[PDB]
């Protein structure tokens, strides 16, 4: 048969089989299990520090691996490295393109990445013999704006772009070694696994995918949202992750079961979620919102346990230190705060 | 601090110098004009509007000791709503439309001529949430084709409910009014119109006058008097 009639119906039955298999392995909800445990009391946090000096909106930040330094990117074409203990500026790096939308910190402390609205990811060298900060490599192989970038080691980095592709690079040569394809809409974020052997991404077609870094193509696909996905993060264990979309909701997904676990929403919340982060023990889930304030969720019972108010505009960034000492939040009014 | 060591005062001084540099360079970026250059497909924006002087594409020029920055986002080809709020503080928006298009149909859809989706794009951009109080500069290019096309093929092809003299001036005025009536704010936003074609100067001057007016009105509203 020349016409493609029978092959079109093949995908319809295959989708049903996965749906049926998922239902067959749903014994009980998470609420029924974590019901008798003692709920966490009210969580009160105070603004210990307030870092100022940015003159425009702040779009991203990343914590250092020693839990003392952090980097911040703003739409005035500046990268700043802070000292959170003493509120000191260690470096100030000017950018060639001021439309930056992401930033990252090397897990060794020698390198810093950038990019956005230019299809180009720039790598900066911090430990330099002549005493300044210079751009070392300039990766350019994308056709859409850059959304996220995460360092693998001193010589590998993975980026996601708005052209529905993610790429694994080799900074020594500057050439893509693997390309991850399959997303329909633009990809907005990604999260690296604790062991750096897998990663997940969220795109504008309201879906999430789990990739394999070594071999290089998709393994599982998670659905359930009803709008764009702007934030994603990994559970500290490594067997779950959480997504934050644009329909004023957050969700928890399980890799080993391919199931919905929990939903974190309330009636008086109608704006979207811009950020998501976890706690060291994996008990507190923090999320930023467009109603100018952040929220703290008890991840085991879905109840709300606190509010982080004090920002005068949208909350766009959110991060927790490696030792769980503090929490930093950025916002569109050009102020960062540390909460303890 | 009276308890700081010898190697912490130097760090504090370094931070002070960093802050001074940031502040000094941050007041030079408030004395330049940022123009988001939009337009339609094959509307002649690159022919004259981007040629009138000397991913994202950026252009710089100076006219009567005032600094301009033009941002061309024609080649992006992505979801517009995910990055349209980046240009939330631009001074104005430049729009280029070819009015010799009323007879020419779209290269992909033959149902309607490209003027209709040009109007649709203008409506969508003008009534945006992020551009409530940002004025718009409107350009009507390649007017050397319009009169000789209208002397044979009249405006009835594009506008069937129009009744006029079928001359150049009346048709141009009707098109200008049709485009200007799409505004829905009428109190916080103003539209400036111009006929460009390919003429010697008279474009940078128009942009300079419009941005001077916008700056004056913005300062007047900010200082209290409104």
């Amino acid at each position, epitope marked *: 048969g020349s016409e493609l009639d029978q092959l079109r119906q093949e995908a319809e039955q295959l989708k049903n089989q996965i749906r049926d298999a998922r239902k067959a392995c749903a014994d009980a909800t998470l609420s029924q299990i974590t019901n008798n445990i003692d709920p966490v009391g009210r969580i009160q946090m105070r603004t210990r520090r307030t870092l100022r000096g940015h003159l425009a909106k702040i779009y991203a930040m990343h914590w250092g691996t020693d839990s003392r330094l952090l980097v911040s990117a703003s739409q005035d074409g500046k990268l700043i490295i802070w000292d959170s203990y003493t509120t*000191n500026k260690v470096h100030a790096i000017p950018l060639r393109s001021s439309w930056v939308m992401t930033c990252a910190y090397a897990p060794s402390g020698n390198y810093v990445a950038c990019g956005g609205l230019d299809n180009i990811c720039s790598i900066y060298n911090l430990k330099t013999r002549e005493g300044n900060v210079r751009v070392s490599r300039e990766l350019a192989g994308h056709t859409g704006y850059l959304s996220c970038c995460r360092f693998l080691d001193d010589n590998q980095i993975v980026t996601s772009s708005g052209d529905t592709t993610c790429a694994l690079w080799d900074i020594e040569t500057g050439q893509q070694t693997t390309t991850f394809t399959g997303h329909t809409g633009d990809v907005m974020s990604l999260s690296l696994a604790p062991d750096t052997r897998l990663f997940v991404s969220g795109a504008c077609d309201a879906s999430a995918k789990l990739w394999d870094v070594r071999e290089g193509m998709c393994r599982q696909t998670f659905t359930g949202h009803e709008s764009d996905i702007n934030a994603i993060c990994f559970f500290p264990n490594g067997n779950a992750f959480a997504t934050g979309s644009d329909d004023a909701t957050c969700r928890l997904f399980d890799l080993r079961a391919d199931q919905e676990l929990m939903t974190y929403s309330h009636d008086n919340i109608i704006c979207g979620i811009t950020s998501v982060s976890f706690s060291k023990s994996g008990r507190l889930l923090l999320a930023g919102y467009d109603d100018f304030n952040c929220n703290v969720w008890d991840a085991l019972k879905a109840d709300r346990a606190g509010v982080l108010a004090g920002h005068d505009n949208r909350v766009s960034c959110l991060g927790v230190t490696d030792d769980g000492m503090a929490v930093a939040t950025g916002s569109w009014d050009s102020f960062l705060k540390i909460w303890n | 601090g009276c308890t700081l060591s*010898a190697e912490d005062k130097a760090a504090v*001084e370094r931070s002070k110098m960093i802050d001074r540099n940031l502040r000094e360079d941050g007041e030079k970026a408030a004395r330049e004009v940022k123009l988001l250059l939009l337009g339609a497909g094959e509307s002649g924006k690159s022919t004259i509007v981007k040629q009138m002087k000397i991913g994202i594409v950026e252009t710089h020029f100076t006219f009567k000791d005032l600094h301009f920055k033009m941002f061309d986002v024609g080649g992006q080809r992505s979801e517009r709503k995910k990055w349209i709020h980046c240009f939330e503080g631009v001074t104005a928006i430049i729009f280029c439309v070819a009015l010799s298009d009323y007879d020419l149909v779209l290269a992909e859809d033959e149902e309607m001529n490209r003027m209709h989706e040009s109007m649709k794009l203008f409506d969508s951009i003008c009534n945006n949430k992020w551009f409530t109080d940002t004025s718009i500069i409107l350009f009507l290019n390649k007017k050397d084709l319009f009169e000789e096309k209208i002397k044979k093929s009249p405006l009835t092809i594009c506008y069937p409910e129009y009744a006029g003299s079928n001359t150049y001036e009346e048709a141009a005025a009707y098109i200008q009014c049709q485009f200007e009536d799409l505004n829905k704010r009428k109190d916080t936003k103003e539209i400036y119109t111009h006929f460009t074609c390919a003429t010697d100067t008279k474009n940078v001057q128009f942009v300079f006058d419009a941005v001077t007016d916008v700056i004056i009105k913005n300062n007047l509203k900010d200082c209290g008097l409104f």
Partner: single-chain antibody
Amino acid sequence: VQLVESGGGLVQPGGSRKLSCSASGFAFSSFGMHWVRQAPEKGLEWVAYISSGSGTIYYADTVKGRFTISRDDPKNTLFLQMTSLRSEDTAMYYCVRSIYYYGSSPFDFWGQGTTLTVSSSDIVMTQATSSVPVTPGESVSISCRSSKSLLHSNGNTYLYWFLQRPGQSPQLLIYRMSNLASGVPDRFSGSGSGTAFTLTISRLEAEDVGVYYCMQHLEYPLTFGAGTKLEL
């Protein structure tokens, strides 16, 4: 990186001399600069310090009001105004760069120096065993002591170690008593507790022969100790 000094020579007592150094190969405008003195067959002696941006200037008690330091940012030149002299300043003057931020390592590049043969509450750091016979392939330990505790409230321990090979300029080995410098072998190590410090070096070679100094940076003025000349 490069630092070349010029302006030496003999000076009759009471006169004045001009000293300058030229920096080429690094961002000179973000690095504090020092002057360090060494008399013939004696130890090191800190002299002055000018910060980044000419904000803070310090001096030694011996030269306060008599020596002046100046910076020339556009052409990357560091000066030292030298007023009325005596028959005591006969020594060799070095130039050292230093940068201060969280995690930096001051006293990286030490320049070369220029001969200056003149015609005719402070913390105390002590070193012993000025001469120690050593053999290759073994391990030897060096000890330095202080009067006041160098442990600050923030946890830092401002103790430094340097090496002056025969006929060469001092080079940094260990900064803040625990961190190894850049471009040095892993054999060297350092340890201490509060007041007593010990430098551990194992598997010496022919290039390990020289004099080792201990310096404190807790507060100004900076005091240099004596040295131990390792001999084959």
